[PDB]
Ligand binder design. Structure first.
Ligand SMILES: *[C@@H]1O[C@H](CO)[C@@H](O[C@@H]2O[C@H](CO)[C@@H](O[C@@H]3O[C@H](CO[C@H]4O[C@H](CO)[C@@H](O)[C@H](O)[C@@H]4O)[C@@H](O)[C@H](O[C@H]4O[C@H](CO)[C@@H](O)[C@H](O)[C@@H]4O)[C@@H]3O)[C@H](O)[C@H]2NC(C)=O)[C@H](O)[C@H]1NC(C)=O
Ligand SMILES: *[C@@H]1O[C@H](CO)[C@@H](O[C@@H]2O[C@H](CO)[C@@H](O)[C@H](O)[C@H]2NC(C)=O)[C@H](O)[C@H]1NC(C)=O
Lengths: 59, 162, 54
């Protein structure tokens, strides 16, 4: 459940440092979401296969 | 919500010329025209013009104006007939003062002079006023608009809306 | 500042309405202040201009 996404990330010509701050802010969230998404899928996939094994063993 | 409206009756200013044009802004045909919402006023002759307005609408008003930076004394004299021309526009409690500036710039679109554009927002039941002795492009038209909380931005593309 | 703590100072610059108001308050069509803190220089030249009355 996400907040409204915006594309307004433009600053004037003499504010390139502020643009760089915006650029690295999005880089930080890109790294956070990518790493968490990768390990979420890897962890859940291993647990899902274990879930089927437990169900088979329980029968 | 977004409405263009007429905000200033330019005919009420005397001893001055309005609706001035230039060949740098042609029609679709060709020739000399100017921005629809911005009224170029010339030949103030040093005289001072006063205007007042109240936003009695239930929406904030967006107004855009311009300040003329002439190239030299001769160009200033031809357009306005005086080596003066300064505008103070007040929106609510902010004061914006644009003193006369005379300076050459590199020629773009046949212009060594410049018209620099500014804007402001007049909230409902708030006022704005203009005091000008020349070198001003008036906000004859403005947009009444309704803000939304979720800000989107601008999509840069050559495609058409499907 | 010979104290062992930094000092905060606040000042103001007067923008008069016209030549008459400038003459009444200061008796001269001049009045400019340069305040230097360390190696920064802050210069406030005289400005005379009407504003809306508040
Ligand atoms: C600006 O941008 C924000 C973010 O996108 C928008 O805010 C979202 O608005 C929507 C719709 O108004 C919100 O979605 C609604 O959430 C309600 C609350 O959900 C919680 O509680 C219910 C139980 O009551 C749980 O089931 C649910 O999982 C949550 O825990 C729901 O009650 C709403 O249900 C509606 O949709 C269902 C079908 O999906 C229908 O069956 C219902 O009858 C009902 O119509 C709905 O899901 C969302 O939560 C908001 N998110 C945020 C972050 O604010 C703004 O709307 C947007 N502004 C504009 C003008 O567009
Ligand atoms: C905005 O402009 C209006 C109109 O000039 C101001 O209201 C008027 O004030 C005079 C007194 O100076 C009254 O006689 C009028 O009756 C008022 N008109 C209305 C419609 O109320 C108003 O004060 C201005 N707003 C600000 C903040 O200065």
């Amino acid at each position: 459940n996400t907040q409204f996404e915006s594309t307004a990330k433009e600053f004037n010509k003499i504010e390139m440092r502020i643009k760089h701050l915006s650029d690295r802010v999005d880089d930080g969230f890109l790294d956070v979401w990518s790493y968490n998404a990768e390990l979420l899928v890897l962890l859940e996939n291993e647990r899902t296969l274990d879930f089927h094994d437990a169900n088979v063993n329980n029968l | 919500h977004f409405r263009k409206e007429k905000i200033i009756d330019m005919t009420r200013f005397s001893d001055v010329t309005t609706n001035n044009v230039d060949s740098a802004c042609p029609y679709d045909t060709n020739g000399a025209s100017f921005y629809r919402n911005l009224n170029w006023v010339q030949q103030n002759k040093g005289k001072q013009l006063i205007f007042h307005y109240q936003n009695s609408e239930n929406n904030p008003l967006l107004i855009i104006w311009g300040v003329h930076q002439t190239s030299n004394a001769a160009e200033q004299n031809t357009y306005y007939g005086s080596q003066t021309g300064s505008t103070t526009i007040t929106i609510g409690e902010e004061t914006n003062t644009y003193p006369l500036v005379i300076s050459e710039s590199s020629i773009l679109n046949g212009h060594s002079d410049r018209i620099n554009y500014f804007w402001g927002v007049v909230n409902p039941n708030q006022n704005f006023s203009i005091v000008s002795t020349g070198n001003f492009i008036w906000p004859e038209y403005g947009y009444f608009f309704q803000k939304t909380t979720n800000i989107s931005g601008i999509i840069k593309s050559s495609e058409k809306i499907s």
